[model samples]
Target: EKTNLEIIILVGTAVIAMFFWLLLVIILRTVKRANGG
Candidate 1:
């Protein structure tokens, strides 16, 4: 049981999830700010 692939997948998943999560938040706030302004 190497588990190397599993570790990579977990890390990759977390990275992608966080990246998109923050990206969505930034875009959402920017959109609202643009519209409000």
Candidate 2:
């Protein structure tokens, strides 16, 4: 049970990181377009 809990936490953190990364990419693209790049 302890190991399972640890694995879950690691996976959750990874997912959160990916989500933020994608969000950052999207924001960058939007800003670039707004700047007429």
Candidate 3:
């Protein structure tokens, strides 16, 4: 029985977190490749 705002915030945070996670993975991969891996 969460409030509407609470649900919205949770969803927004989850999406943002996922996006950052993806970005981090991409950056890490690029760095690894640049290091000759």
TM-score of each predicted structure versus truth: 0.72, 0.72, 0.82
Q: After superposition, how far is residue 37 of candidate 3 from its true place, in Å?
A: 6.4
> What would the per-residue lDDT of candidate 2 be over residues 1-37, giving only the tens digit for each residue?
9999999999999999999999999999999999995
Please write out the lDDT profile of model 3 over residues 1-37, one tens digit for every residue.
4699899999999999999999999999999999995
- Judged by lDDT against the true structure, how good is candidate 3? 0.95
Q: Of the candidates numbered 1 and 3, which has the greater lDDT value?
A: 3
Ten residues in sequence with the least summed lDDT for candidate 2: 28-37
lDDT (Cα, 0-100) at 10 in candidate 1: 94
CA deviation > 4 Å runs, candidate 3:
none
Clashing pairs in 2: none
Model 1 misplacement above 4 A = none
Report residue 32 deviation for candidate 1 (angstroms): 0.9
Tens digits of lDDT, candidate 1, 5-34: 899899999999999999999999989999
Evaluate candidate 3 by giving its C-alpha RMSD to the native, one decimal. Answer: 2.4
